[PDB]
Coordinates of C-alpha atoms in Angstrom, one line a residue:
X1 CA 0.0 0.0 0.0
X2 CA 1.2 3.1 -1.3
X3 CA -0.2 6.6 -0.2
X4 CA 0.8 10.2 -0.9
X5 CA -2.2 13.2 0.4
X6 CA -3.3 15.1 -2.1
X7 CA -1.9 18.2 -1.2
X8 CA 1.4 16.8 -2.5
X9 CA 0.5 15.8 -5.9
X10 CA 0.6 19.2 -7.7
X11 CA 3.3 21.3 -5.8
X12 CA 4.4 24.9 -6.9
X13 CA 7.6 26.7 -6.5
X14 CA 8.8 30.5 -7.3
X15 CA 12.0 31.0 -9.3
X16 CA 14.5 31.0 -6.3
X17 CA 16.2 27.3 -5.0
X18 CA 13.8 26.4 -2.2
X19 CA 12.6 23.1 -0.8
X20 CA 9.5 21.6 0.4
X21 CA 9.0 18.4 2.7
X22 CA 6.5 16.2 1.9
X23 CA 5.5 12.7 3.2
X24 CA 5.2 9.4 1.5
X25 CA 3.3 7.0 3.7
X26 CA 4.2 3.5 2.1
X27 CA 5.4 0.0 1.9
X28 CA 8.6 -1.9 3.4
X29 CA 10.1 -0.5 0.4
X30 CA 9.5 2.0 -2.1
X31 CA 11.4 4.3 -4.7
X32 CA 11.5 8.0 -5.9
X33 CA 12.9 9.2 -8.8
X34 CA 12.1 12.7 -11.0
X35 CA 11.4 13.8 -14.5
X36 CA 14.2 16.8 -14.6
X37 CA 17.9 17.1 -13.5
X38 CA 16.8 21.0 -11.4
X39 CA 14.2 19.1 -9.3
X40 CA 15.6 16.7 -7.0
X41 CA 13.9 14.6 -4.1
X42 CA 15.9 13.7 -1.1
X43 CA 15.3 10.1 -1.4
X44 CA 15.7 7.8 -4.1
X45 CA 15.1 4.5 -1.9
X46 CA 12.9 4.6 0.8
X47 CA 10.7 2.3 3.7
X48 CA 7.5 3.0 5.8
X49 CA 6.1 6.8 6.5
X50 CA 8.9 9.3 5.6
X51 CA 9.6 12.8 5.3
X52 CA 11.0 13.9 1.6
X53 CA 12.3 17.2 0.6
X54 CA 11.6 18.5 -2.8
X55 CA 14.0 20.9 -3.9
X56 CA 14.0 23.0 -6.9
X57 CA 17.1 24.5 -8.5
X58 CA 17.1 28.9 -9.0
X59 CA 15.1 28.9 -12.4
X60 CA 17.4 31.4 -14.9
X61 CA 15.4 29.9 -18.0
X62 CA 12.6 33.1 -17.8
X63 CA 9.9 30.4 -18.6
X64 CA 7.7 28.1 -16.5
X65 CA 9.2 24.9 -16.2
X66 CA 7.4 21.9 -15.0
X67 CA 8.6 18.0 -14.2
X68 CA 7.2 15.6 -12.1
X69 CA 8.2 13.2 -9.3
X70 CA 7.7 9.5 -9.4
X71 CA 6.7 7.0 -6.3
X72 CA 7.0 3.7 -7.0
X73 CA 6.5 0.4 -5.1
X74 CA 5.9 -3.0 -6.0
X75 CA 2.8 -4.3 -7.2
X76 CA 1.0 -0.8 -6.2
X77 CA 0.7 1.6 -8.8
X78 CA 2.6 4.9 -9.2
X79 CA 2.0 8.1 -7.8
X80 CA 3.1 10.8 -10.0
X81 CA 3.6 14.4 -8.3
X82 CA 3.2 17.7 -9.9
X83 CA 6.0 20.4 -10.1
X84 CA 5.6 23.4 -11.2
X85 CA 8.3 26.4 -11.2
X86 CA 7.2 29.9 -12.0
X87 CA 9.8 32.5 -13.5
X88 CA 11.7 35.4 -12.4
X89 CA 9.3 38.6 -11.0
X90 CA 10.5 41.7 -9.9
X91 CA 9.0 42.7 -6.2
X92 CA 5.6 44.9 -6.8
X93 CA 6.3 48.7 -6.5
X94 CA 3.6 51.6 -6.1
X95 CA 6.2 54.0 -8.2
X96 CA 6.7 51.0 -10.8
X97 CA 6.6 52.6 -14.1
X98 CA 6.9 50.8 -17.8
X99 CA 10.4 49.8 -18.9
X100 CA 11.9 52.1 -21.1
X101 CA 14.6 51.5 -23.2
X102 CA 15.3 55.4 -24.0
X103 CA 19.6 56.1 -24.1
X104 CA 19.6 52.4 -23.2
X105 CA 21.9 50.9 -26.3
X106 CA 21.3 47.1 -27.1
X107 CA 24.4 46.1 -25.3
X108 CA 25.2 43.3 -23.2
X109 CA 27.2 44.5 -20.3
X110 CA 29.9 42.8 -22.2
X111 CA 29.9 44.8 -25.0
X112 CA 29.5 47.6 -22.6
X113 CA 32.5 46.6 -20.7
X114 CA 34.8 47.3 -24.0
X115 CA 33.6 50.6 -24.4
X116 CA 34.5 51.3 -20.9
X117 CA 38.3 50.9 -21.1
X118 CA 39.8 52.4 -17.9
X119 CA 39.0 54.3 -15.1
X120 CA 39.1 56.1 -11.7
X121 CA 37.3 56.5 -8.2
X122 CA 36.6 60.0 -6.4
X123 CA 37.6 58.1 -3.5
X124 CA 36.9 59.2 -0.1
X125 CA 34.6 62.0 -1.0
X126 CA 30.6 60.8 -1.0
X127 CA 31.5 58.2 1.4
X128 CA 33.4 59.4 3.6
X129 CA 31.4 59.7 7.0
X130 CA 33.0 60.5 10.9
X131 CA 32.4 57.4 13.0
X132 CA 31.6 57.3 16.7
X133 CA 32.4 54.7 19.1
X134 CA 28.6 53.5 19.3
X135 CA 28.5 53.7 15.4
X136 CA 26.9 56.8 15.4
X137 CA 27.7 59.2 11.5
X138 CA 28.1 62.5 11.2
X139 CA 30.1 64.6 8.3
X140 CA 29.6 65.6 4.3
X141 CA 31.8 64.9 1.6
X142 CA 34.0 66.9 2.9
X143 CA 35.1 65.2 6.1
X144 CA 38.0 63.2 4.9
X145 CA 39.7 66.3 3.1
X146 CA 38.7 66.3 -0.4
X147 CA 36.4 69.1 -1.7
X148 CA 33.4 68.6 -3.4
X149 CA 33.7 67.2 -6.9
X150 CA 33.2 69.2 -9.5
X151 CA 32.9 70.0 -13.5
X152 CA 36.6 70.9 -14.1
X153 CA 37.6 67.5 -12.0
X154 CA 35.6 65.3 -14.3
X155 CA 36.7 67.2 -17.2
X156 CA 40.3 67.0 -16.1
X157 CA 39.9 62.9 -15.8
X158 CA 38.3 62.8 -19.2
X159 CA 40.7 64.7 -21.1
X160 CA 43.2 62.2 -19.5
X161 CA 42.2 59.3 -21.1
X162 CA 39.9 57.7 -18.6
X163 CA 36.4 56.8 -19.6
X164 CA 34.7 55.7 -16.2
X165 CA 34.6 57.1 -13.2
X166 CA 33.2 55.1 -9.7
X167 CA 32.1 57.5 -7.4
X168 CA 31.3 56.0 -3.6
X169 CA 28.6 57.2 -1.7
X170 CA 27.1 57.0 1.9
X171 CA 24.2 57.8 2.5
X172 CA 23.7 56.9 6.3
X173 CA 24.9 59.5 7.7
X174 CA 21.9 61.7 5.8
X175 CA 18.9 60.7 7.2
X176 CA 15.9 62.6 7.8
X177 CA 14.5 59.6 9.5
X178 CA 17.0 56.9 10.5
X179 CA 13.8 54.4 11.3
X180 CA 12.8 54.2 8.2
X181 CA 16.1 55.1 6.7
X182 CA 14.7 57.9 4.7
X183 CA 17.9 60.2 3.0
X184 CA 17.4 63.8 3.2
X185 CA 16.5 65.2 -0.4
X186 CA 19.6 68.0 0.2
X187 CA 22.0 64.9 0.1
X188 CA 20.6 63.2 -3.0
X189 CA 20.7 66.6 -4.6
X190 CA 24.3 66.9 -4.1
X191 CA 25.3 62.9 -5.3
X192 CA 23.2 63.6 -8.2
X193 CA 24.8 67.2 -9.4
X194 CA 28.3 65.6 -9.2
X195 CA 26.7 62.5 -11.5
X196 CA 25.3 64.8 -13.8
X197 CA 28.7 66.7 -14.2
X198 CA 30.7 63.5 -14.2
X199 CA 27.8 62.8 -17.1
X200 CA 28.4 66.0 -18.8
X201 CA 31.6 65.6 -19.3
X202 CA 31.8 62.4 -21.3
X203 CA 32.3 59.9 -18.7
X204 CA 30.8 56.5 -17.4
X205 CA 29.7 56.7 -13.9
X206 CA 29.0 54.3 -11.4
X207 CA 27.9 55.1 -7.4
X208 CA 27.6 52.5 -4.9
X209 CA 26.5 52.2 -1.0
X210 CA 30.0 52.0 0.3
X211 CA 31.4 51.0 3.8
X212 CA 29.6 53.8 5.4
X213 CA 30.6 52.5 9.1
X214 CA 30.1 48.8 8.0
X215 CA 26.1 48.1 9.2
X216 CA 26.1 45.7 6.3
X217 CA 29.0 43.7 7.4
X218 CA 27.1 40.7 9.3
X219 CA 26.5 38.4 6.7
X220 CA 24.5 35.8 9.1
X221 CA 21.3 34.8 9.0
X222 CA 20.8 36.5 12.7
X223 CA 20.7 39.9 10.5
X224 CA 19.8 38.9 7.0
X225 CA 16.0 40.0 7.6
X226 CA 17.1 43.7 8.9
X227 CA 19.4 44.2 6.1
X228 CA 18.4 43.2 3.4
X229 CA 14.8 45.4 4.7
X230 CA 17.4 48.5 5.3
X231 CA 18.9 48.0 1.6
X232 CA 16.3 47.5 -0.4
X233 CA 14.9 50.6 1.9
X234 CA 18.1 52.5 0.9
X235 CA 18.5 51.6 -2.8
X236 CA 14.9 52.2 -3.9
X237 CA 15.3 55.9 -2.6
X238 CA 18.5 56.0 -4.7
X239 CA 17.1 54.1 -8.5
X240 CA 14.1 56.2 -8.0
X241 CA 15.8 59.3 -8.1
X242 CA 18.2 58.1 -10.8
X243 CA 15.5 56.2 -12.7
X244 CA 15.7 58.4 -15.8
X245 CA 19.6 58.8 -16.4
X246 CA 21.1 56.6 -19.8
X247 CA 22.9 53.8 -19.7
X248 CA 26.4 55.5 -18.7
X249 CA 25.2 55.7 -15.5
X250 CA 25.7 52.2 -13.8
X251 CA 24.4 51.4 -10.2
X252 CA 26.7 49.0 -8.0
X253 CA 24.5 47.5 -4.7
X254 CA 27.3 47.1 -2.0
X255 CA 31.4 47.7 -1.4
X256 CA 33.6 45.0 0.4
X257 CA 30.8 42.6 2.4
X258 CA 32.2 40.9 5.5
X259 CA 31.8 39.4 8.6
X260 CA 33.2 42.0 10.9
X261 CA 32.0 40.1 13.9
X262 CA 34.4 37.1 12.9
X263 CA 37.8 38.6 13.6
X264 CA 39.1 37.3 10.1
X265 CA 37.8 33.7 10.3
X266 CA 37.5 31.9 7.0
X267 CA 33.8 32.8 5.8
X268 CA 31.1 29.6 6.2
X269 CA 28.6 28.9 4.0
X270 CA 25.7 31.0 5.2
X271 CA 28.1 34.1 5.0
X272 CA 28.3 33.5 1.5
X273 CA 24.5 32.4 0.8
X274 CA 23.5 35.9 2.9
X275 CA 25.7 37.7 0.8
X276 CA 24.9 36.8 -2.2
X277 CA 21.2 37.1 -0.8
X278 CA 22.4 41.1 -0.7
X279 CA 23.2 41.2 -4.5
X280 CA 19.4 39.6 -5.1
X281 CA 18.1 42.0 -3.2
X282 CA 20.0 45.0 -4.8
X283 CA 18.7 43.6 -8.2
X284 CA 15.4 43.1 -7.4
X285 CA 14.9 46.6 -6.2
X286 CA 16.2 48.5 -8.9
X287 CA 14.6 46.5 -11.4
X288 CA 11.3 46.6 -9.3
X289 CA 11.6 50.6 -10.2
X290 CA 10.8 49.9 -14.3
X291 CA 11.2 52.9 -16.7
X292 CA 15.5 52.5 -17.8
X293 CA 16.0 50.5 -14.3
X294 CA 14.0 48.0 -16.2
X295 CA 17.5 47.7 -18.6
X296 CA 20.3 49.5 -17.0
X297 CA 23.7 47.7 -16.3
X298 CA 24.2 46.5 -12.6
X299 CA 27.2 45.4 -10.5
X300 CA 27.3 43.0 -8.1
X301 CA 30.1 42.3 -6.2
X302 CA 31.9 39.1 -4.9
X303 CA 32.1 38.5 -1.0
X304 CA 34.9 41.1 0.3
X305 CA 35.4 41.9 -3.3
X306 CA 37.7 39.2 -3.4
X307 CA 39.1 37.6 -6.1
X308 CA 39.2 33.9 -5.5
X309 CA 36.3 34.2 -3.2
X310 CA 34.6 35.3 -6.7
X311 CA 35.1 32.3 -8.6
X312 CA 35.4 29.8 -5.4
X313 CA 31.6 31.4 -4.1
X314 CA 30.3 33.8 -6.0
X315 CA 26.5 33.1 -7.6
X316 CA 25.3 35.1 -10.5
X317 CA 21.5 36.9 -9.3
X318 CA 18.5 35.8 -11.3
X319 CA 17.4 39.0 -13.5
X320 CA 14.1 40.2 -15.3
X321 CA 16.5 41.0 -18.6
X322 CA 19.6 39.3 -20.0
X323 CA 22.7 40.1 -19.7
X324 CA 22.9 43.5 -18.3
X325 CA 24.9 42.4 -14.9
X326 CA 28.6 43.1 -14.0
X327 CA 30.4 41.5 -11.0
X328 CA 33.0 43.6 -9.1
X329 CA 36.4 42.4 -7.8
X330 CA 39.3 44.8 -5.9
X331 CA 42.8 44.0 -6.4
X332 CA 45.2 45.3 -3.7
X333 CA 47.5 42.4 -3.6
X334 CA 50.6 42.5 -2.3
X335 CA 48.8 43.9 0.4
X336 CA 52.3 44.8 2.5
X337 CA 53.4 47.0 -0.6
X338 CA 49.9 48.6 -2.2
X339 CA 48.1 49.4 1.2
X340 CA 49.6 48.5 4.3
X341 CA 50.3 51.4 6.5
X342 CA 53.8 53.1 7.1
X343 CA 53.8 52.5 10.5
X344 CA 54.1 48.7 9.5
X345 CA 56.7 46.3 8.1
X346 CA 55.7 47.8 4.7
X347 CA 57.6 46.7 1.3
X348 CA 58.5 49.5 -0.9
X349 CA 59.3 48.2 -3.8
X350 CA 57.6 45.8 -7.0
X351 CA 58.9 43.6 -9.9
X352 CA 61.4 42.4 -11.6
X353 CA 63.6 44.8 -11.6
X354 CA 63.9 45.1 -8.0
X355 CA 64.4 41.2 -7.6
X356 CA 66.1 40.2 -4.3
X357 CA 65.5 43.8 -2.6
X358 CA 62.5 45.3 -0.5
X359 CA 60.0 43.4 -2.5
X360 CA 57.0 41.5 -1.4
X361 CA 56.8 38.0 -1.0
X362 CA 54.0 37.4 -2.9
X363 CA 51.6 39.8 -5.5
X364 CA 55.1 39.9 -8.1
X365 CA 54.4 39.5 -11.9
X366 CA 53.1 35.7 -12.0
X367 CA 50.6 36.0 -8.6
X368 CA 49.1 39.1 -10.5
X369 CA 48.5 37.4 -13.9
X370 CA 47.8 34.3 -11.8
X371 CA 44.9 35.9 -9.8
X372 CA 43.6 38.1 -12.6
X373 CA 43.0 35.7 -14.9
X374 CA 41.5 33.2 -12.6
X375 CA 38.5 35.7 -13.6
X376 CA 38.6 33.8 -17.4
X377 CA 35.5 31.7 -15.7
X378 CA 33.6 34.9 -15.2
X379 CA 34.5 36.4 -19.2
X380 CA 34.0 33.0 -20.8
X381 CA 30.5 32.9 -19.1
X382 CA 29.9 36.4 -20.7
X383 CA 29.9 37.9 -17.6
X384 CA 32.3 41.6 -17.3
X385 CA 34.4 42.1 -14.7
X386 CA 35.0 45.6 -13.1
X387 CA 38.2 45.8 -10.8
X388 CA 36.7 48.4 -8.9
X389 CA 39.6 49.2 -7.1
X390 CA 43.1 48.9 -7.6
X391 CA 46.2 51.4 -6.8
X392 CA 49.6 51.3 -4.8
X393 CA 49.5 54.4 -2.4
X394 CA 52.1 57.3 -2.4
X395 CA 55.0 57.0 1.0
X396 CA 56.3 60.3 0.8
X397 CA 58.5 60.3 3.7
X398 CA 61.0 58.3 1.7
X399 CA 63.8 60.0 0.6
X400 CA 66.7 59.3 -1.7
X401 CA 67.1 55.6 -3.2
X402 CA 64.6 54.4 -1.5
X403 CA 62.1 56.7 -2.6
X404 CA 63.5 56.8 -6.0
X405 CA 62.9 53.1 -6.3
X406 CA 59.7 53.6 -4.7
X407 CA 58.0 55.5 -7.2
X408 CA 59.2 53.8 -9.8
X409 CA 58.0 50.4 -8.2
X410 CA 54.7 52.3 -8.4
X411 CA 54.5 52.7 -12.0
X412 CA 55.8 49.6 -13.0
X413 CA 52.7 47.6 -10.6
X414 CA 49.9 49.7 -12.0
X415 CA 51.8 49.6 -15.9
X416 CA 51.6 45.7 -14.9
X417 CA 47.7 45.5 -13.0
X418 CA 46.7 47.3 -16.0
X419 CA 48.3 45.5 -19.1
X420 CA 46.9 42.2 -17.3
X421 CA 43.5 43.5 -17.1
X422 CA 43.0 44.4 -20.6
X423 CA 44.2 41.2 -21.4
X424 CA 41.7 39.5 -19.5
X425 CA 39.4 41.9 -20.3
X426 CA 38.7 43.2 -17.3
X427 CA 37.9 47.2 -16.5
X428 CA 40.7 48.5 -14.2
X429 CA 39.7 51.6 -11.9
X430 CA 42.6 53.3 -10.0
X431 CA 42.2 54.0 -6.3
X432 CA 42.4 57.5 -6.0
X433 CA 41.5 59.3 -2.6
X434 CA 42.7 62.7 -3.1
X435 CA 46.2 61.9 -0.6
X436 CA 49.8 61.2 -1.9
X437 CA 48.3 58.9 -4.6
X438 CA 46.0 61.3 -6.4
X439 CA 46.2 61.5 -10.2
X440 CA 44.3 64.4 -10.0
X441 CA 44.7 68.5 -8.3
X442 CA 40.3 67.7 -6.9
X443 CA 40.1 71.4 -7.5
X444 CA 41.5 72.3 -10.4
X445 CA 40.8 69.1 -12.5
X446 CA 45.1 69.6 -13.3
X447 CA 47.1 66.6 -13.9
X448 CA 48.7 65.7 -9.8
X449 CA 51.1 62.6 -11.2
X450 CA 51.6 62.6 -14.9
X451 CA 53.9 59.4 -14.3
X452 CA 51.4 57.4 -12.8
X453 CA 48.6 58.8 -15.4
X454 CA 51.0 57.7 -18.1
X455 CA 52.1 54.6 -16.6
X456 CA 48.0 53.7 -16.5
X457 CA 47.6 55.1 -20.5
X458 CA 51.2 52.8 -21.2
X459 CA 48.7 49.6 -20.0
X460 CA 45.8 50.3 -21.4
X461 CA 48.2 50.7 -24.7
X462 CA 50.8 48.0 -24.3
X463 CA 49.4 45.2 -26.3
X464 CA 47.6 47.4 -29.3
X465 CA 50.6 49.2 -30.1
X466 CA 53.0 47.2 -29.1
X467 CA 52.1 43.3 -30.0
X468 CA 53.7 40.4 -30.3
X469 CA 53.4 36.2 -31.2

């Protein structure tokens, strides 16, 4: 005797990977199999009254897709379950408008990506936010030194050579009502002028939330209700108000997403489902919005921004349209050379040519082509890759050989981070936060480093110009 209620024999799932129990109340022994390779059951061999999950792979496919599940004994007939999978909806906003494809070319982000070329941040300028002991933020754009950016500084980067630029923003430290987590009009006024002049003057522009005290930085299922609420929250404020802007303006959900509760312990595998879960959520939001949200480019980034955490962990979100989704990587490696502070065993210089003296022990020529074009998986897939950040910083208190040795180091690691990305196809944007390493005077728009400018243009030029078998 074989019996399955008949509230399991037509199941129904939505488009995400979810699972369902269900009992099979039968025989000393009895079998399942199922109909299609996405919809598995628990249990392929099974005795008596049991509980079997159902689970249904993410459906990508953008159609219905149906199978069904088989229970089989001997000499009782089969029962055949019902499975039903719906396809990808966007959550159901009151401000939904129609998509429009209006300055929205017919590009994949792909094709997009070759257009971009190079880059650079306005780095710690829209996100840069005074943080209290309690977490508490306070400032402007202002607060970490840099003035606010303007026409002649986007202009300046342009004329340079550079195509994109990646502004980061906070926005949590502008709230006219932190319950609800609305941002004070006056702030998204100011984000969006410096967009529109970074627009205006010919360039690609992508804003983020960034770090902004690190609220999002408890990946954990503890947390994941709260904040995903809080970004979605956050990032419906910001499409809305961007919703009608062409396709040079890119959105980018989060910055470097980690655990900062787990002092540095290797990340589990619900820090990297909840992460992940972020990017969904980013997605669905914007294209919730409609009118060009419907078609802009996103870009989602991989857990810390991480390289190998990309391809080890990182899980492309399901999408209303195709192929209009980016992931984000940073590149900072050697750490004790690009970033480390001076007041630590630092190593000042890079490369080849300084072979068996204050180099690095790892993050030399073969780690960076090594790492960079582990991201192949991600270009072969058709999926672009933005390396959203990379850039040595600037130790001026070295003097003589060493800091002879030092700049040059410089130029030849961003000449090298560079030439490697275009090779892998990959969009490079330099790390600039308006300190030592600037490329740019942030008031006049004026050439800063005309060496490290060149030794970015020499990259981005190596292999055209100068090719070889």
């Amino acid at each position: 005797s074989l019996e399955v209620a008949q509230e399991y024999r037509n199941l129904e799932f939505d488009a995400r990977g979810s699972r369902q129990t269900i009992q099979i109340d039968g025989p000393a022994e009895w079998h399942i199999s199922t109909s299609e390779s996405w919809c598995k059951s628990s249990h392929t061999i099974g005795e008596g009254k049991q509980y079997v999950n159902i689970t249904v792979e993410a459906n990508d496919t953008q159609k219905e897709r149906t199978a069904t599940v088989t229970v089989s004994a001997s000499g009782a007939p089969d029962i055949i379950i019902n499975v039903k999978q719906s396809l990808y909806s966007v959550p159901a906003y009151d401000e939904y408008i129609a998509p429009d494809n209006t300055g929205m070319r017919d590009l994949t982000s792909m094709q997009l990506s070759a257009l971009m070329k190079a880059g650079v941040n306005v780095g710690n300028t829209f996100e840069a936010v005074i943080v209290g002991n309690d977490g508490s933020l306070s400032g402007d754009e202002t607060c970490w030194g840099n003035p606010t950016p303007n026409k002649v500084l986007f202009e300046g980067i342009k004329a340079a050579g550079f195509d994109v630029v990646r502004i980061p923003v906070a926005y949590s430290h502008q709230f006219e009502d932190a319950a609800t987590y609305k941002i004070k009009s006056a702030w998204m006024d100011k984000v969006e002028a410096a967009v529109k002049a970074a627009l205006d003057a010919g360039l690609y522009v992508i804003i983020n939330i960034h770090w902004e005290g690190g609220w999002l930085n408890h990946p954990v299922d503890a947390n994941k209700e709260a904040l995903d609420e809080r970004l979605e929250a956050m990032w419906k404020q910001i499409a809305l108000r961007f919703r009608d802007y062409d396709d040079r303006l890119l959105f980018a959900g989060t910055n470097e997403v980690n655990n900062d509760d787990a002092n540095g312990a290797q990340p589990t595998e619900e820090n990297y489902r909840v992460q992940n879960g972020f990017n969904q959520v980013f997605v669905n939001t914007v294209r919730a919005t409609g009118g060009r949200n419907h078609y802009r480019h996103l870009i989602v980034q991989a857990y810390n921004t991480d390289v190998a955490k990309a391809v080890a962990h990182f899980t492309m979100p399901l999408d209303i349209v195709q192929n209009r989704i980016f992931l984000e990587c940073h590149y900072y490696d050697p750490y004790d050379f690009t970033i480390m502070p001076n007041d630590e065993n630092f190593k000042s210089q890079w490369g080849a040519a300084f072979a068996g003296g204050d180099v690095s022990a790892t993050g030399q020529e073969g780690d960076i082509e090594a790492t960079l074009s582990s991201l192949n998986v991600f270009i072969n897939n058709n999926v672009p890759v933005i390396i959203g950040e990379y850039g040595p910083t600037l130790r001026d208190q070295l003097t003589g050989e060493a800091l002879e040795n030092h700049l040059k180091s410089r130029n030849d690691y961003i000449e090298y981070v560079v030439k490697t990305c275009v090779k892998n196809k990959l969009v490079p944007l330099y790390w600039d936060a308006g300190y030592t390493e600037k490329l740019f005077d942030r008031t006049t728009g004026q050439p800063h480093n005309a060496a490290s400018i060149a030794a970015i243009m020499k990259g981005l030029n190596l292999e055209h110009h100068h090719h070889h078998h």
